Amino acid sequence: HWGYGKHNGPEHWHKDFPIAKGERQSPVDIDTHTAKYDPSLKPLSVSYDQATSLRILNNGHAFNVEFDDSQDKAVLKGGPLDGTYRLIQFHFHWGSLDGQGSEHTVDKKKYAAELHLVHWNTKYGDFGKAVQQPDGLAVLGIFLKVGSAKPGLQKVVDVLDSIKTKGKSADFTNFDPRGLLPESLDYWTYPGSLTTPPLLECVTWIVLKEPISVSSEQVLKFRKLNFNGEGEPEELMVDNWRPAQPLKNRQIKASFK
Ligand SMILES: [Zn+2]
């Protein structure tokens, strides 16, 4: 039932998901002047050479590229994390307008879009057990700005016409998520939550400082997707982002001096 519209959108999620007013909700604004360098953060390790994408799907809120997480084929390690986190899916949030779209902000600056690579902690049995624990998920967040085209994104963009509406899916093999990374993996990290219902506070957030650059042509294809199912009145899939939430007692740690 929840969405991003006037009445089912983020400002009303708390009616059905009371955790929405919890102590470590995401996203948050990253105040660069308050986020301290932490020299105990170990280097961020990403092992994606054996990543096995399976399918792409429009679930009515975003589109998800799903991966085989049955073994350590595509794992995140290091940084603030203890243990091994398996990539399960990635998706985007974007705006109707280049000036908005990102979930996290940096000194209140909004980016045009935000990519989330979602991983879960093999400490737990599976995704379902991991989401129920404060140390269960690690989400790598990567800002998008409008500029030159992102070649590693073109394979995703080139299949969006086949998943225009909610419920549609398609096979989507051999996608290399490495092609979505920026040059620097300098990042900020803090403990937080899912940014969509059920909004569980199970996420170690790792937000990269350097955005990737995508083309107008590429984001205009994002904005052509539909929230609605085929045959229902069109609602364009745009502004599917949750705004910054209160930071409360939390500190953002920076990985760079
Ligand atoms: Zn997300």
Numbering used by the authors: 4 to 260
Study authors write:
The starting point of this study is the solid state structure of a complex between human carbonic anhydrase II (HCAII) and a helically folded tetradecaamide aromatic foldamer with a nanomolar HCAII ligand appended at the N terminus of the helix. In this complex, the foldamer is achiral but its handedness is biased by diastereoselective interaction with the protein.
Crystallization was attempted for all foldamer–HCAII complexes. For the four structures, crystallization conditions were similar to that of 2·HCAII, and so were the unit cells and packing arrangements. The structure of 3·HCAII then validated that the phenethyl side chain of Q5Ph10 filled Po4 as predicted by computations. In this structure, Lys24 was again visible in the electron density map, but in a conformation where hydrogen bonding to QAsp13 is not established, different from the structure of 2·HCAII. Altogether, the solid state structures validate the predictions made by computations.
